[PDB]
Design an enzyme around this catalytic site. Structure first.
Site, PDB file in Angstrom:
ATOM      1  N   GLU A  35      -1.616  14.034   0.848  1.00 23.65           N
ATOM      2  CA  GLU A  35      -3.026  14.012   1.247  1.00 23.65           C
ATOM      3  C   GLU A  35      -3.468  15.299   1.962  1.00 23.65           C
ATOM      4  O   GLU A  35      -4.548  15.819   1.678  1.00 23.65           O
ATOM      5  CB  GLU A  35      -3.344  12.786   2.121  1.00 23.65           C
ATOM      6  N   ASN A  46     -15.808  14.892  -1.106  1.00 25.57           N
ATOM      7  CA  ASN A  46     -15.815  14.003  -2.267  1.00 25.57           C
ATOM      8  C   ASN A  46     -17.082  14.208  -3.090  1.00 25.57           C
ATOM      9  O   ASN A  46     -18.087  14.711  -2.576  1.00 25.57           O
ATOM     10  CB  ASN A  46     -15.700  12.539  -1.826  1.00 25.57           C
ATOM     11  N   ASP A  48     -19.291  12.157  -4.130  1.00 29.97           N
ATOM     12  CA  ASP A  48     -20.435  11.371  -3.653  1.00 29.97           C
ATOM     13  C   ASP A  48     -21.086  11.934  -2.383  1.00 29.97           C
ATOM     14  O   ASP A  48     -22.052  11.363  -1.870  1.00 29.97           O
ATOM     15  CB  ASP A  48     -20.048   9.891  -3.467  1.00 29.97           C
ATOM     16  N   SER A  50     -19.483  12.382   0.586  1.00 27.23           N
ATOM     17  CA  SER A  50     -18.652  12.060   1.745  1.00 27.23           C
ATOM     18  C   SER A  50     -17.494  13.060   1.860  1.00 27.23           C
ATOM     19  O   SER A  50     -17.246  13.834   0.938  1.00 27.23           O
ATOM     20  CB  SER A  50     -18.131  10.627   1.645  1.00 27.23           C
ATOM     21  N   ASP A  52     -13.275  13.718   3.411  1.00 26.47           N
ATOM     22  CA  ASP A  52     -11.993  13.191   3.895  1.00 26.47           C
ATOM     23  C   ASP A  52     -11.473  14.084   5.027  1.00 26.47           C
ATOM     24  O   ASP A  52     -11.505  15.312   4.908  1.00 26.47           O
ATOM     25  CB  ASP A  52     -10.957  13.146   2.764  1.00 26.47           C
ATOM     26  N   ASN A  59     -11.906   8.761   4.991  1.00 22.46           N
ATOM     27  CA  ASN A  59     -13.217   8.982   4.364  1.00 22.46           C
ATOM     28  C   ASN A  59     -14.399   8.632   5.274  1.00 22.46           C
ATOM     29  O   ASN A  59     -14.442   7.550   5.860  1.00 22.46           O
ATOM     30  CB  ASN A  59     -13.292   8.148   3.072  1.00 22.46           C
TER      31      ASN A  59
END
Length: 129
Positions: A35, A46, A48, A50, A52, A59
């Site tokens: 990750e 991301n 959309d 958003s 991380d 998120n």
């Protein structure tokens, strides 16, 4: 802060992540590796809108507030910048809430694709835990 493998394993054990919801310590170390490469300052956007955040790439869509994900939730009740600290308490506590949510560690795409069904014990080998 970029953690060493055994350093992170020890911090995660100390924070009670070892066998949390039946996931052994190696699962969490493996997930953190893929990750964020063990980097607490890791951030990724991301599609959309958003983002991380942190070693476990939590998120802003659901878990934290970054002031720029309109209409999202803040289920862990934290600013997303708390997830980027050299101290992993906030990340670990939020991860405990995520993993309890119903999907387990499948919430982490990198875990599902790269850790699940593998010999995760190898990630804690040689460490003085």
């Amino acid at each position: 802060k970029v953690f060493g493998r055994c350093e992170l394993a020890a911090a995660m054990k100390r924070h009670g992540l070892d066998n949390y919801r039946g996931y052994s310590l190696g699962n969490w170390v493996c997930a953190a590796k893929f990750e964020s490469n063990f980097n607490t300052q890791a951030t990724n956007r991301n599609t959309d809108g958003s983002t991380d955040y942190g070693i476990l790439q939590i998120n802003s869509r659901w878990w934290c507030n970054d002031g720029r994900t309109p209409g999202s939730r803040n289920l862990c009740n934290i600013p997303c910048s708390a997830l980027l600290s050299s101290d992993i308490t906030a990340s670990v506590n939020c991860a405990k809430k995520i993993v309890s949510d119903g999907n387990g560690m499948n919430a982490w795409v990198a875990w599902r694709n790269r850790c699940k069904g593998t010999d995760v014990q190898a990630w804690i080998r040689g460490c003085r835990l």
